[PDB]
Amino acid sequence: DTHEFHKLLIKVVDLFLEDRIKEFELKLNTTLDELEFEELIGKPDSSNSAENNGIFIDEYSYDASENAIKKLFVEYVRQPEFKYTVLSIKGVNDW
């Protein structure tokens, strides 16, 4: 169920970070708890947070073989009890 769904989401990101998935877009509606959300993120080399009309967009950077950089975009709405409703996840390549 929902736990295995979120496990998958995390792995999707990991395979993106491995460049086994080159780039991806997910459109979702599910809600994560903190440990899930943080795991999803891994360790960026820098992060940005932006907000508009209650909607948050986070931008995470991951360095790989130069000048190849991985970027992950997470769109979510913050929820009571340290939870996060993910609306979309997007992975991209940059220089």
- Residues binding its own copies (CB under 8 A): 5, 8, 11-12, 15, 20-30
CB of 22 to its own copies, least distance (A): 4
Cβ-based nearer residue to its own copies, 47 or 64: 64
Q: How many CA atoms lie within 13 A of 8 on its CB side?
A: 8
What distance in Å separates the CA atoms of residue 94 and residue 67, rounded to the nearest whole number?
8
Distances from the Cα of 74 to the Cα of 34, 61, 66, angstroms? 14, 12, 24
CB of 57 to its own copies, least distance (A): 17
Cβ-based nearer residue to its own copies, 22 or 46: 22
